[PDB]
């Protein structure tokens, strides 16, 4: 997790997938002054083991594609370092029942 | 006429004859080819 | 844009691709038709006046149920084992009370299925209850029964856990309203309900509830499609009778990258 | 009756007709350019229109599989064009396509070797695949016949002829590019087809294609599919009067532009005066499918008329798709002038006698209602409690207003009778713009006199109607289940509570509202004499006078 | 495929749409001169008779409720409580 | 003539879930028509001589696998048009793409 | 194109699906063995239907010229007789389904012969198949 | 998004119930980003072809549909209307079958 | 060569025949529409195993009418010729242009241009034959041929084939 102040070189970063299995992320400075999760509208998220995942899918009979998505370069997706294939459980307030449980997979 | 419909339709109609004041109106009518034109300007006074 | 959206036999809202847009229509699975504006008592007022209403202490001359309500008020008076179950309840309600203020606005009026306010006004004269002769309920009758009730307010039915969690979850708010009107203090001091009455109300709530649930098939998208546009179809570009009204809504639905009047509201810091 | 099994579509597969197939399927060579006249003799020459295809006038012709007009679909024919033409609507992709494939050879411009491509090449999605690809292959323009392998740039084959690939741009209906040493301007001929044909089968698959249902190449037409009469019908002023479709012109025009073309490719061919006539064929074929394009030339039919292009006939509202398919005019329907009645139950709807005597309902004969039916049948179609058509099992219809056996007839269980709507019959009533769930509701029929739909007052605001001239459409159900469906889901009582605002949508309007206020005031007193005539007026009265 | 009589999840009540079509079919069945199993107590409209046949839960029919994935759930008209 | 049942009128009915009734409008009370598709090349080729049973459908040469369907004549034309534009609308009575 | 290069239609891959939704190995059905499966069903059919082949046809046959022929031919060419003699072969043989059947329903003496009428093997099965090949003609029941 | 549409409705005194706006809002958000209710949005997803074909680019919508050879389920409301079959819409969102087993208990 | 594929078929039934013992009728009706059929797709349908206990499952009721739609899922014994495939049958007829063979319910023909040169048709010989420097083929005789091509037709599949290589022909 390198924290580039302004920007890394195009010649540079072309050596990130050159050290697999491991993976590296890049975050601009001026974009991390305030944690976005702490925000009112931003609900608390949570990851899900490939057991709890292979359960969720089974418990509702869902085919992955049938699941609400989230962009890979999404501020929260990055923040929690998601990956193409990972799920995220969202728990927010609901003026009809109190609490709803939504999930978004990271494509 | 010809393969030239690139004219303007509306001009010349079938004069109303429902009532006298109808017919009258029709002759004294003006058109205006196409949110601002539709407005009722002052100049219309 | 919503045509192919329709509730499914498990209560999921999806489309012509099966993509789940909502796991439980409206986040509760209730059909708007069967819903009315109720007022969740619990939420408003001070903890002091709250306590002076729902707090019960069988070990005290002034904060106990007057013997004009039960038929065994004195032979029940002082039981330590019961006053603990009376805490469990009250300890719950406080978890609730603080969890509901966790709607920071305070507005206690909300749309909620099963009009408990009326259903009791109905009980009032079906069995004709006098504001004179004491009721006849064990403290267990009521509390356990309302616990047994919550258990039957089933939306989802699943065997496993994941479902049963969703169950409790997308219900909760309701349950609190239920308790709010089924607290020991009120059910006995205000409307002396008999054993019969209680057994009726429950049975009806249960039945009513199950009917207030959405019916699978309901072409929801087409429904919501109109439901939204209609009170928009009835307006004037005139903002009579910042960029607002008709064009703004348009602007939004178009997901415009450059609205005329942008603006942004920021609140100060704590202090 | 047809022995073949009845089924429903569970899947629709799109692709493109392969010329060899279109040829195959075609049952008419369609070579001649005339109309019919077998040399002035009136018929239909085996050349153009009807050379065995369908027919009109209850005339068996239809590739002899008779059936005549109704039962008989149109019948396709073809026409071998002399030379390949560009498909008016594909010119966009075709160009971005060439930017990605090499000419003079015909193979990819990026193999598994390059990484960023692999990813894209693995993206399983016929559209998002073809997206990422072009953004890459649009730069490199040299079909290297020798290139440094994935080792040492010392040693160096794949496809050959490293000819520089041109940068194409759109100028009217023609694609041109330059080849570079030093560029080359040339007007790219329709070479392209050949290159596609050559493209490897395994390459097709690399892009979002399928060697079986749609290969890139089939985007250019060789043998043109000629559509039959039912597609481009003639409208005669009875019979012995012309009446020809828009398309029934631009076909012979195409034909002629084909003929003349060929008659320039077998005679003194002025090589730079031919292109001027190919572009012409190219044009008439542009016309035929679309005649509202960029390079103006509207191509108007003698009079100024625009000439509906197939895609015009489809343009939303009125045009086929949204006009005839997504919503069509239907039978068993009626419309007239509305006027409210304060003495009709909420869910009723007073219907004008005239109308009741027109709309029917197929009700099967049963030993429970035979008695009632036997009265209704004798009355005839001009008497109110009557009927107007009797249909025996043997799919044929007796017209109840003429037939010599009018009062005779004894029914037979299992037959169906179409009766006039009667009191307490569910029917679909509506008012457009239909923007509500409540804009259509089932009402009970109540036959009344006078030419107008009599609806209740309180149900005015849902449709949002008034009586200042407004008209209303009425539709009439047809099945035994349909009815149930009308009363179990569209009944007025179920609609009383609007789901959008969890509140009703029908209250007490005008007079009734205005007055109930007065009538309510403490100052409002009523004496016995009136207090009697009022309880009587209440149908639901418990029959007990309150103290 | 399948799905045992056990682990059945859908509603035990008959959705108006289910009910609506059931009354539908059986109605035309009767109008196809089929046999009715009750006492038309002066009743004469098939759909009423069926509505009665319903209120008395005596309509031999089974509803296979399908789930988005492709599996199904069978329930009888006898089973499904018909309060309303 | 006859009154149009345009989009907005469709919509409403769909909200009501009046599936069948709608299917009964667009077909029984208007268009309707019995077309014969081919079990192989999903097209409207079949030479159905309703007498000598003869069905056929050359170019794909079949006479055995053919299906019957009930669709609005208005639509049949839409397809012929689409065909006449060189696009191929295959109709399958069985799913083939799987998943 | 369709050829005996073992590139049969898409409808007959070694892994087909059971009516109950399961996976099952193809079904090779050599002569004689076929004559039994048929006869067995045709018998237990004509059993509850009452609760030597020309007759049995115009009763359990469509009334189906095809069966008489399919019964004669399958009895004038069957290369075996006992449900055991066929079992042995299966208890043995279990190569791709088509072969294990063809080898059983087609006469063969030499390997040179089999390898000639089935030119696709050669390296698609070790030589000691030859042993077996003898072992076949070796258990090629006597007359 | 919800808050914003609501504030356009509530400034006119009119009230609409959450679930509705929610549903819309969700469909726009769910597909990964912000699909606008316009030719450059919903009408451009992996949805059915006949469906999207019934709005704006009607013909062109088909060209690039037969081009990449799309396969349409016919599970979408539109398709069936165009075909004339009962769509899986309430009344038809299920089957009615005679159970022979009980059809013996039925005599 | 014979297989046992688990196929299925759909049959519609008018409401009249909607009694209590239907499964029985369905089963027996299946056979009358299957046993004896022939499709180029699946070949020659000859026998349905385990009749008695066929599985029918619930059938659905068509909305329009009252009829029921049944998806009968069975299993059967079939036999279909493939190209390059090798089998042997009895010669049925025999002229100067070749001979016709009968494989079960089938009839395959061998062209005089697809046989080995050295086998000419014998003229006035009883029974009518074809002569080789040593061999002789006639009706009775069993011949092993190779099916070059197969043509699927109505309710019968005919074909063509040859005996020109070596180790092929009569036996
Ligand atoms: Zn015909
Ligand atoms: Zn090249
Ligand atoms: Zn075909």
Q: Are D452 and D352 in contact (CB under 8 A)?
A: yes
**Domain match, I171 and I107 both:** yes
Separate counts of helices (H) and strands (E) for chain I: 1, 17
Q: How far apart are CA D326 and CA D314, in angstroms?
A: 11
Q: How far apart are CA C21 and CA C61, in angstroms?
A: 57
Q: Are D319 and H58 in contact (CB under 8 A)?
A: no
Cβ–Cβ gap H32/A95 under 8 Å: no
Q: How far apart are CA C188 and CA C182, in angstroms?
A: 10
Coil/strand/helix, residue C214: coil
Q: Give me D91's structure tokens.
A: 């010119």
CB-based contact, H71 to chain E, within 8 Å: no
Q: Are I95 and I103 in contact (CB under 8 A)?
A: no
Going by the DSSP 8-state scheme, the letter that residue D510 receives in this structure is H
How large is the C-alpha radius of gyration of chain A? Answer: 17
Question: Could you tell me the sign of the dihedral formed by the alpha carbons of D47, D49, D51, D57, in that order?
Answer: negative
Task: Tell me which residue has tokens 């542009």.
Answer: D286
Q: Are C6 and H89 in contact (CB under 8 A)?
A: yes
Long-range contacts of D96-100 (CB under 8 A, 24+ apart): D96/D134, D96/D138, D97/D216, D98/D165, D98/D168, D98/D192, D99/D134, D99/D137, D99/D138, D99/D165, D99/D168, D100/D133, D100/D134, D100/D137, D100/D138
Q: Are I70 and I59 in contact (CB under 8 A)?
A: yes
Q: Which residues pair with D263 in a beta bridge?
A: none
Q: How far apart are CA D377 and CA D409, in angstroms?
A: 9
Torsion of CA H54, H58, H61, H62, to 10 degrees: 90
Crossing angle for the helix pair C82-100 and C173-180, to the nearest 10 degrees: 130
Task: Tell me which residue has tokens 């079986």.
Answer: D212
D69: number of CA atoms within 13 Å, CB side?
5
CB-based contact, E29 to chain I, within 8 Å: yes
Domain boundary among I32, I67, I82: I82
**Domain match, I3 and I75 both:** yes
Crossing angle for the helix pair D480-489 and E46-55, to the nearest 10 degrees: 60
Q: How far apart are CA D4 and CA C263, in angstroms?
A: 67
Long-range contacts of C144-150 (CB under 8 A, 24+ apart): C145/C198, C145/C202, C146/C178, C146/C179, C146/C182, C149/C178, C149/C202, C149/C205, C149/C206, C150/C175, C150/C178
Q: Give me F75's structure tokens.
A: 């639509």
Q: Are F76 and F44 in contact (CB under 8 A)?
A: yes
Task: Give every CB contact of residue H56 below 8 A, 6+ residues apart in sequence.
Answer: D316, H39, H43
Q: Are I5 and I23 in contact (CB under 8 A)?
A: no
Q: What is the DSSP string of E41-72?
A: SS---HHHHHHHHHHTT----EEEEEPTTS-E
- In order of D264, D273, D288, E8, the CA distances from D261 in angstroms are 5, 11, 17, 71
Crossing angle for the helix pair C220-233 and H2-9, to the nearest 10 degrees: 40
Q: How far apart are CA C155 and CA C158, in angstroms?
A: 10
Q: Which residues pair with I69 in a beta bridge?
A: I12, I60
Going by the DSSP 8-state scheme, the letter that residue D70 receives in this structure is S
**Breaks in chain G at C–N > 2.5 Å: after which residues?**
51, 63, 94
Q: Which residues pair with D150 in a beta bridge?
A: none
- Give, for I71, the enclosing helix (H) or strand (E): strand I68-73
- In order of C100, C143, C185, C204, C241, the CA distances from C94 in angstroms are 10, 16, 15, 27, 45
Q: Are C8 and E11 in contact (CB under 8 A)?
A: no
Q: How far apart are CA D37 and CA I42, in angstroms?
A: 50
Q: Give me D476's structure tokens.
A: 């009439």
Q: Distance from the CA of F83 to the center of ligand 1, in angstroms?
A: 18
Task: Give every CB contact of residue C73 below 8 A, 6+ residues apart in sequence.
Answer: C65, C66, C67, C134
Going by the DSSP 8-state scheme, the letter that residue B22 receives in this structure is H
In chain F, helix, strand, coil percent, each to 5? Answer: 30, 20, 55
Q: How far apart are CA I125 and CA B36, in angstroms?
A: 107
**Known binder of ligand: residue D137?**
no
Q: What are phi and psi of I90, to 5 degrees?
A: -80, 130
**Domain match, I69 and I87 both:** no
According to DSSP, the β-strands at I76-79 and H95-98 are unpaired
Q: How far apart are CA D41 and CA D50, in angstroms?
A: 15
Out of E25, E65, E76, whose CB is closest to H94?
A: E65
CATH label of the domain that carries residue I20: 3.30.1490.120
Q: Which residues pair with E72 in a beta bridge?
A: E66
- In order of D418, D456, I95, the CA distances from D422 in angstroms are 12, 18, 79
Q: Give me C126's structure tokens.
A: 């079906």
Going by the DSSP 8-state scheme, the letter that residue E13 receives in this structure is B
Q: How many CB pairs under 8 A join B and D?
A: 20
Q: How far apart are CA H50 and CA H64, in angstroms?
A: 13
ω into residue D66 within 30 of 0, thus cis? no
Out of H50, H67, H70, whose CB is closest to D93?
A: H67
Residue G98 class from Cβ within 10 Å (0-12 exposed, 13-18 middle, 19+ buried)? buried
Which chains are adjacent to chain A, needing at least 3 Cβ pairs under 8 Å?
Answer: C, E, H
Task: Give every CB contact of residue H89 below 8 A, 6+ residues apart in sequence.
Answer: C6, C217, C219, F14, F17, F18, F19, F22, H77
* Angle, CA E62 vertex, CA E61 and CA E65 arms, to 5°: 145
φ/ψ region of E65 (left if φ > 0, alpha if ψ in -120 to 50, else beta) reads beta
**Domain match, I56 and I98 both:** no
Q: Give me D530's structure tokens.
A: 């009136």
**Known binder of ligand: residue F57?**
yes
| CATH number for region A35-107 | 3.90.940.20
CA nearest neighbour of D204 among D263, D104, D126, D273: D126
Q: Which residues pair with F86 in a beta bridge?
A: none
Experimental structure resolution, Å? 4.3
- In this structure, chain C runs to a length of 271
Out of G44, G98, G117, whose CB is closest to I167?
A: G117
CA nearest neighbour of G28 among G83, G118, G100: G100
φ/ψ region of C247 (left if φ > 0, alpha if ψ in -120 to 50, else beta) reads alpha
H71-72, strands of its sheet edge to edge: F87-92, D11-16, H71-72
CB-based contact, E10 to chain C, within 8 Å: yes
* Angle, CA D330 vertex, CA C16 and CA F80 arms, to 5°: 65
Contact list, D302 vs chain B (CB under 8 Å):
2-3
Q: Are I51 and I26 in contact (CB under 8 A)?
A: no
φ/ψ region of D62 (left if φ > 0, alpha if ψ in -120 to 50, else beta) reads left
- In this structure, chain H runs to a length of 107
Task: Give every CB contact of residue G3 below 8 A, 6+ residues apart in sequence.
Answer: I83, I84
Question: Which of F19, F21, F27, F42 should one mutate to test binding to chain H, selecting the residue with the greatest count of H CBs within 10 A?
Answer: F19
- In order of D95, D216, D470, F80, the CA distances from D98 in angstroms are 5, 11, 59, 31
Out of F17, F26, F31, whose CB is closest to H89?
A: F17
Residue D109 class from Cβ within 10 Å (0-12 exposed, 13-18 middle, 19+ buried)? buried
Coil/strand/helix, residue F34: strand
Task: Tell me which residue has tokens 């190569």.
Answer: G95
Q: How far apart are CA D384 and CA D378, in angstroms?
A: 11
- Give, for H49, the enclosing helix (H) or strand (E): helix H49-52
**Known binder of ligand: residue D62?**
yes
Q: Are D493 and D347 in contact (CB under 8 A)?
A: yes
Q: What are phi and psi of D516, to 5 degrees?
A: -50, -30
**Known binder of ligand: residue D204?**
no
Q: How many CB atoms lie within 10 A of CB G1?
A: 5
**Breaks in chain I at C–N > 2.5 Å: after which residues?**
none
Secondary structure (H, E, C), D255-276: HHHHHHHHCCCCCCCCCCCCHH
Q: Are H90 and D489 in contact (CB under 8 A)?
A: yes
Q: How far apart are CA D140 and CA D158, in angstroms?
A: 15
CA nearest neighbour of G102 among D302, D163, I82: I82
Q: Give me D258's structure tokens.
A: 């084909």
CB-based contact, H89 to chain D, within 8 Å: no
φ/ψ region of D120 (left if φ > 0, alpha if ψ in -120 to 50, else beta) reads alpha
Q: How far apart are CA H15 and CA A85, in angstroms?
A: 41
CA nearest neighbour of C245 among C236, C255, C253, C254: C236
According to DSSP, the β-strands at D416-419 and D396-398 are unpaired
Out of I10, I63, I64, whose CB is closest to D5?
A: I10
According to DSSP, the β-strands at A98-106 and A87-94 are antiparallel
**Known binder of ligand: residue D160?**
yes
Please name the CATH architecture into which domain E1-83 falls: Alpha-Beta Complex (3.90)
Q: What are phi and psi of D168, to 5 degrees?
A: -95, 150
Q: Are G103 and G139 in contact (CB under 8 A)?
A: no
Q: What is the extent of the structural domain holding I3?
A: 1-82
CA nearest neighbour of A75 among A104, A39, A36: A36
**Known binder of ligand: residue D143?**
yes
Question: Which of C21, C34, C157, C211 should one mutate to test binding to chain E, selecting the residue with the greatest count of E CBs within 10 A?
Answer: C157
Q: Give me C104's structure tokens.
A: 């920071």
- Residue in chain I closest to E2 (alpha carbons) equals I57
Crossing angle for the helix pair C195-212 and C139-152, to the nearest 10 degrees: 10
Q: How far apart are CA D78 and CA D263, in angstroms?
A: 20
Q: Give me F92's structure tokens.
A: 């399958």
Q: How many CB atoms lie within 10 A of CB C213?
A: 20
CA nearest neighbour of G114 among G92, G97, G90, G131: G131
Cβ–Cβ gap I41/F65 under 8 Å: yes
| Nearest CA distance, D503 vs chain C (angstrom) | 7
Q: Which ligand is nearest to the CA of F34?
A: 1
Coil/strand/helix, residue D497: strand
Q: Are D460 and D364 in contact (CB under 8 A)?
A: no
* Angle, CA I134 vertex, CA I131 and CA I140 arms, to 5°: 60
Crossing angle for the helix pair D480-489 and F19-26, to the nearest 10 degrees: 130
Q: Are D453 and D350 in contact (CB under 8 A)?
A: yes
User: What domains are there in chain F, each with its CATH number?
Assistant: 1-85 (3.90.1800.10)
Going by the DSSP 8-state scheme, the letter that residue C62 receives in this structure is S
- What fold does the segment set G29-143 form as a domain? Growth Hormone; Chain: A; (1.20.1250)
Q: Give me I17's structure tokens.
A: 């025949």
- In order of C64, F38, F46, F67, F72, the CA distances from F55 in angstroms are 91, 10, 6, 11, 22
Q: Are D475 and D458 in contact (CB under 8 A)?
A: no
Q: How far apart are CA D203 and CA D209, in angstroms?
A: 9
CA nearest neighbour of D177 among D165, D189, D161: D165
Strands (DSSP E) contained in D178-275 are: 186-187, 221-223
In chain G, helix, strand, coil percent, each to 5? Answer: 50, 5, 50
């Amino acid at each position: 997790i390198f924290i580039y102040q302004n920007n890394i070189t195009p010649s540079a970063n072309k050596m990130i997938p050159t050290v697999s299995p491991a993976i590296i992320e890049t975050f601009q400075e001026s974009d991390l002054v305030v944690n976005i999760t702490h925000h009112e509208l931003v609900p608390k998220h949570i990851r899900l083991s490939d057991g709890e995942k292979s359960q969720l899918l089974q418990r509702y009979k869902l085919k992955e594609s049938q699941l609400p998505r989230i962009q890979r370069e999404d501020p929260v997706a990055r923040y929690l370092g998601l990956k193409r294939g990972q799920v995220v459980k969202i728990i927010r307030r609901s003026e009809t029942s109190g609490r709803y449980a939504s999930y978004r997979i990271c494509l | 006429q010809k393969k030239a419909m690139s004219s303007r339709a509306g001009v010349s109609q079938v004069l109303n004859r429902y009532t006298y004041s109808s017919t009258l109106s029709h002759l004294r009518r003006t058109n205006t080819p196409i949110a601002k034109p539709r407005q009722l300007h002052n100049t219309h006074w | 844009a919503l045509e192919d959206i329709m509730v499914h036999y498990d209560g999921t809202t999806r489309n012509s691709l099966g993509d789940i847009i909502q796991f439980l229509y409206g986040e509760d699975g209730l059909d708007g038709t069967q819903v009315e504006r109720q007022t969740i008592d619990t939420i408003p007022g001070s903890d002091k006046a709250f306590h002076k209403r729902y707090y019960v202490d069988l070990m005290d001359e002034k904060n106990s149920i007057k013997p004009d309500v039960i038929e065994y008020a004195a032979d029940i008076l002082g039981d330590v084992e019961l006053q603990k179950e009376l805490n469990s309840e009250y300890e719950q309600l406080v978890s609730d009370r603080k969890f509901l203020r966790e709607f920071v606005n305070g507005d206690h009026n909300w749309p909620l299925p099963v009009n408990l306010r009326r259903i009791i006004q109905n009980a009032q004269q079906i069995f004709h209850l006098d504001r004179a002769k004491a009721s006849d309920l064990t403290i267990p009758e009521i509390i356990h029964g309302v616990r047994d009730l919550c258990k039957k307010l089933f939306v989802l039915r699943g065997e496993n856990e994941l479902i049963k969690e969703a169950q409790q979850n997308a219900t909760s708010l309701f349950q609190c309203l239920v308790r709010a009107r089924l607290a020991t203090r009120r059910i006995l001091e205000e409307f002396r309900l008999n054993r019969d009455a209680f057994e009726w109300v429950l049975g009806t709530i249960e039945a009513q509830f199950q009917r207030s649930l959405v019916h699978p098939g309901e072409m929801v998208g087409v429904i919501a499609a109109q439901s939204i546009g209609e009170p928009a179809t009835q307006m004037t570009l005139n903002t009579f009778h910042v960029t607002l009204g008709v064009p703004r809504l348009k602007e939004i639905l178009n997901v415009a990258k450059n609205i005329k009047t942008p603006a942004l509201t920021v609140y100060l810091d704590r202090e | 009756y047809s022995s073949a099994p009845l089924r429903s579509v569970k899947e629709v597969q799109f692709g493109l007709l392969s010329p060899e197939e279109i040829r195959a399927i075609s049952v008419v060579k369609i070579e001649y350019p005339e109309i019919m006249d077998e040399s002035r003799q009136r018929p239909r020459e085996g050349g153009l229109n009807d050379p065995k295809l369908g027919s009109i006038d209850r005339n068996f012709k239809c590739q002899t599989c008779g059936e005549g007009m109704a039962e008989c679909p149109g019948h396709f024919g073809h026409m071998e064009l002399a030379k390949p033409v560009f498909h008016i609507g594909f010119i966009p992709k075709i160009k971005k396509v060439c930017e990605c494939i090499c000419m003079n050879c015909g193979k990819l411009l990026l193999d598994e070797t390059n990484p960023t491509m692999a990813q894209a090449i693995r993206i399983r999605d016929p559209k998002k695949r073809f997206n990422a690809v072009w953004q890459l292959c649009k730069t490199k323009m040299v079909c290297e016949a020798d290139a440094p392998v994935d080792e040492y740039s010392e040693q160096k084959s794949r496809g050959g002829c490293g000819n520089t690939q041109p940068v194409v741009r759109k100028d009217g209906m023609k694609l041109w590019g330059t080849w570079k040493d030093a560029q080359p301007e040339r007007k790219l001929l329709t070479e392209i087809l050949n290159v596609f044909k050559h493209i490897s089968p395994e390459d097709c698959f690399r892009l979002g294609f399928n060697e079986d249902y749609a290969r890139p190449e089939w985007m250019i037409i060789t043998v043109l599919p000629v559509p039959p009469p039912q597609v481009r019908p003639s409208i005669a002023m009875d019979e012995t009067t012309q009446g020809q479709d828009d398309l029934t012109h631009k076909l012979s025009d195409i034909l002629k532009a084909n003929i003349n073309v060929q008659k320039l490719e077998m005679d003194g061919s002025p090589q730079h005066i031919i292109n001027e006539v190919e572009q012409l064929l190219q044009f008439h074929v542009a016309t035929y499918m679309d005649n509202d394009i960029a390079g103006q030339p509207q191509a108007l039919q003698k009079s100024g008329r625009p000439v509906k292009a197939i895609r015009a006939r489809l343009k939303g509202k009125e045009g086929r798709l949204r006009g005839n398919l997504m919503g069509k005019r239907v039978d068993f329907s009626a419309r007239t002038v509305i006027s409210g009645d304060p003495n009709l139950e909420l869910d009723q709807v007073g219907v004008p006698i005239s109308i009741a005597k027109t709309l029917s309902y197929p009700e099967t004969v049963t030993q429970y209602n035979i008695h009632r039916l036997t009265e209704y049948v004798r009355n005839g179609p001009n008497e109110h409690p009557g009927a107007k058509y009797v249909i025996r099992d043997n799919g044929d219809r007796i017209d109840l207003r003429y037939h010599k056996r009018a009062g005779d007839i004894v029914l037979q269980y299992g037959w169906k009778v179409e009766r006039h709507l009667m009191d307490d019959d569910p029917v679909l009533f509506n008012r457009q713009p239909s923007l509500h769930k409540m804009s259509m509701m089932a009402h009970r029929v109540k036959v009344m006199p006078y030419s107008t739909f009599r609806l209740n007052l309180s149900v005015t605001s849902p449709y949002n109607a008034d009586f200042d001239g407004d008209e209303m459409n009425l539709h009439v159900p047809q099945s035994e289940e349909t009815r149930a469906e009308l009363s179990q889901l569209c009944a007025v009582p179920l609609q009383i509570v609007s789901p959008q605002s969890n509140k009703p949508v029908m209250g007490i309007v005008q007079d009734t509202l205005c007055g109930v206020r007065k009538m309510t005031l403490r100052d409002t007193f009523i004496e016995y004499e009136q207090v009697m005539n009022m309880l009587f007026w209440v149908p639901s009265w418990d029959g007990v006078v309150p103290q | 495929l399948a799905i045992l009589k056990e682990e059945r999840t859908t509603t035990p009540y008959l959705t108006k749409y289910e009910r609506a079509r059931i009354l539908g079919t059986r109605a035309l069945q009767i109008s196809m001169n089929a046999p009715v199993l009750v006492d038309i107590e002066g009743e004469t409209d098939p759909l009423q008779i069926a509505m009665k046949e319903l209120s008395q839960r005596k309509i031999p029919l089974v509803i296979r409720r399908y789930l988005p994935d492709g599996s199904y759930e069978d329930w009888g008209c006898d089973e499904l409580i018909v309060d309303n | 003539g006859g009154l149009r049942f345009g989009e907005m009128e469709r919509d409403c009915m769909i909200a009501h879930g009046a599936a069948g009734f709608l299917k009964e409008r667009l077909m029984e009370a208007s268009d309707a028509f019995r077309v014969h598709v081919c079990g192989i090349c999903g097209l409207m080729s079949v030479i159905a001589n309703l007498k000598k049973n003869q069905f056929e459908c050359r170019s794909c040469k079949n006479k055995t696998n053919i299906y019957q369907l009930h669709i609005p004549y208005a639509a049949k034309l839409l397809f012929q048009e689409l065909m006449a534009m060189n696009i191929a609308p295959r109709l399958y009575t069985e799913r083939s793409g799987v998943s | 194109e369709n050829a005996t290069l073992l590139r049969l239609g898409p409808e007959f891959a070694l892994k087909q699906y059971d009516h109950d939704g399961n996976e099952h190995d193809l079904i090779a059905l050599s002569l004689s063995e076929s004559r039994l499966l048929i006869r067995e069903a045709l018998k237990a059919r004509s059993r509850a239907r009452n609760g030597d082949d020309d007759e049995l046809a115009k009763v359990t046959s469509g009334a189906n010229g095809v069966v008489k022929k399919t019964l004669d031919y399958l009895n004038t060419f069957a290369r075996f007789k006992d449900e055991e003699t066929c079992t042995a072969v299966d208890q043995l043989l279990h190569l791709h389904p088509f072969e294990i059947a063809q080898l059983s329903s087609l006469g063969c003496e030499d390997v040179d012969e089999a390898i000639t009428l089935i030119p696709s093997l050669a390296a698609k099965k070790e030589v000691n198949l030859q042993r077996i090949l003898d072992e076949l003609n070796r258990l090629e029941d006597p007359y | 998004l919800y808050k914003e549409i609501l504030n356009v409705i509530a400034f006119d005194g009119s009230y609409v119930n959450y679930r509705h706006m929610a549903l819309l809002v969700d469909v726009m958000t769910s597909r990964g980003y912000l699909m606008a209710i316009t030719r450059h949005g919903i009408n451009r997803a992996d949805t059915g072809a006949l469906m999207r074909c019934s709005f704006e680019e009607t013909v062109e919508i088909l060209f690039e549909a037969g081009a990449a050879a799309e396969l349409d389920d016919c599970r979408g409301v539109s398709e069936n209307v165009m075909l004339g079959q009962l769509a899986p819409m309430g009344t038809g969102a299920f089957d009615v079958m005679i159970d022979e087993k009980l059809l013996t208990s039925l005599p | 060569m014979f297989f046992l594929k688990d196929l299925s078929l759909i049959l519609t039934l008018h409401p009249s025949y909607f009694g209590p013992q239907m499964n029985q009728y369905l089963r027996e009706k299946l056979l009358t529409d299957v046993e004896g059929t022939c499709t180029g797709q699946f070949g020659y349908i000859v026998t349905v195993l385990d009749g008695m206990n066929i599985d029918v499952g619930k059938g659905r009721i068509i909305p329009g009418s009252g009829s029921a739609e049944f998806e009968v899922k069975y299993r059967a014994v079939v036999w279909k010729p493939f190209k390059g495939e090798v089998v042997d049958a009895i010669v049925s007829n025999v002229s100067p242009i070749g001979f016709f063979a009968d494989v079960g319910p089938l009839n395959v023909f061998v062209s005089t241009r697809l046989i080995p040169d050295n086998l000419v048709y014998n003229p006035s010989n009883s029974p009518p034959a074809y002569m080789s420097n040593d061999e002789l083929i006639t009706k009775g005789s069993k011949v092993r041929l190779k099916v070059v091509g197969t043509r699927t037709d109505v309710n019968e599949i005919y074909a063509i084939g040859s005996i020109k290589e070596d180790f092929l022909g009569a036996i």
